[PDB]
């Protein structure tokens, strides 16, 4: 496909928010891109001095972003023309990753609602929603993939393992995965499908309702694949409601085609909230 092509004189970095494998995100100003054509804040991901595998993945990415539209998946702008570095432009979500930002309104840092976490929980069913309906399937699904905008809005990303962050949740079981993430078929069988990223998503309910813990926090890796590989789950978090772990349960059936299918789920989540907030497009 076409990917819109932004100039590089139009991009001012402002601040540095991380680096990846796939190089440093910016937090950056935009010139032209706006209606108004006015600076509005974007987010950058800048690759410098890319290998060929990586310039193969900068645009297999762009190429997939451009696809892949929907109010709950990562808005991408476009990227900048041949150069160093390559520069990839993004849809600036200023309270960060969620899992972050479940962190900080945890017990261990005022603190989020039922609702509150049940509309977390549907716009990220939402944008799953989405991905089955093109058939793709993530691989990674976690709070720490998803950002978070205004009004609680979140959208799921792919940022992959940090660069220059040590970091818990990726085991070289080659390629360094999410286990604590994965049902034993994934770990197992290297077998990926939508009933996979079902089963993650479980792990996200697990995730929202203790306020960005790890799952399987209390065990090392090799024990992490044992007790799903031995099909023991997570265990319900005291704050949630059995109805919630219930779906949460639903994910995690052993048999993947026993598994809820993501619409289900949504409507469920739906059903479940009091107050379910109301969409609206004008
Ligand atoms: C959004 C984003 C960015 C970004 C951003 C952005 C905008 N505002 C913020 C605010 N905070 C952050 C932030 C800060 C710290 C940390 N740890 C994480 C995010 C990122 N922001 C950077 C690199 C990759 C991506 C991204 O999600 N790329 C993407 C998305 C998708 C969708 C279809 C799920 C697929 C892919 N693929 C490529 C790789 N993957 C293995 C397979 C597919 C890449």
Redo the contacts with the bound molecule.
């Keep these: 496909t076409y990917v819109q092509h932004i100039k590089r004189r139009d991009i001012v970095l402002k601040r540095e ?2 680096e ?1 494998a ?1 190089g440093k ?1 910016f ?1 950056a100003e935009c010139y032209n891109l706006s209606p108004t054509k006015d600076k509005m804040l ?2 950058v ?1 800048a690759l410098k001095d890319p290998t060929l595998a990586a310039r193969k ?1 900068f645009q ?2 762009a190429e ?2 451009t696809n ?1 539209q929907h109010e709950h ?2 808005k ?1 702008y476009g990227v900048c023309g041949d150069g160093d570095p390559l520069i ?1 432009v ?8 969620l899992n ?1 930002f479940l962190r900080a309104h945890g017990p261990d840092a005022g603190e989020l609602g039922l609702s509150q976490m049940l509309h977390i929980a549907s716009q990220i069913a939402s944008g799953m929603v989405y ?1 089955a309906s093109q058939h ?1 399937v ?3 699904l976690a709070t ?2 998803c ?1 978070v905008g205004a009004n609680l809005l979140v959208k ?5 393992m ?1 660069r220059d ?1 040590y970091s818990t949740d990726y085991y070289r079981l080659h390629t360094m995965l999410p286990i604590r993430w994965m049902p034993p078929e994934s770990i197992m069988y290297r077998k990926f499908t939508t009933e996979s990223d079902v089963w993650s998503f479980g792990v996200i309910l697990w995730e929202i309702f203790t306020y960005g813990k790890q799952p399987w926090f209390q065990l090392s890796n090799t024990e992490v694949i044992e007790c799903i590989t031995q099909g023991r789950v997570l265990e319900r978090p005291r704050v949630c409601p059995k109805e919630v772990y219930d779906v949460m349960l639903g994910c995690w059936q052993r048999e993947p085609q026993q598994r809820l299918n993501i619409k289900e789920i949504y409507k469920i989540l739906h059903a479940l909230g009091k107050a379910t907030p109301i969409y609206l497009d004008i």
């Design positions: 928010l991380g990846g796939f995100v937090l974007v987010a991901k993945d297999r990415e997939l972003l892949l998946i990562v991408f990839m993004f849809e600036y979500m200023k309270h960060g990753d972050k991905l793709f993530h691989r990674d720490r993939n950002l799921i990303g792919d940022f992959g940090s962050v």
